[PDB]
Design a protein around this ligand. Structure first.
Ligand SMILES: [Cl-]
Length: 114
């Protein structure tokens, strides 16, 4: 089950709306390229908001392999903040680079969904 991003050339797996800090994701994160994206193209993931430009993430780097970039255990270490969420920004380093944003924001707190 994939969802589209704000970029028509990219799709990605579904992420929770709210999750616990540093806890493994329920669904392994991956970015699917629909267009021309050569194998070996680096892809980085970044999370942040107004207060936090780039929050600490774990395993936020991957490389394209046959139109797919799989992230090995992506985790949100840093918390989004009280009453705030994160905006996931995907950057596919093609020539030139293409940026995509997750269709929705993700909240990261110490306890997670209560
Ligand atoms: Cl952080």
């Amino acid at each position: 089950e994939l969802v589209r991003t704000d970029s028509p050339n990219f799709l990605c797996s579904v992420l929770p709306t709210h999750w616990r800090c540093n806890k493994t994701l329920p669904i392994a994160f991956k970015v699917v390229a629909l267009g021309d994206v050569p194998d070996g193209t680096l892809v980085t993931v970044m999370a942040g908001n107004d207060e936090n430009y780039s929050a600490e993430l774990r395993n936020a780097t991957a490389a394209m392999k046959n139109q797919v970039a799989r992230f090995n255990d992506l985790r949100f270490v840093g918390r989004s903040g009280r009453g705030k969420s994160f905006t996931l920004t995907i950057t596919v380093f093609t020539n030139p680079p293409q940026v995509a944003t997750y269709h929705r924001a993700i909240k990261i707190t110490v306890d997670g969904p209560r």
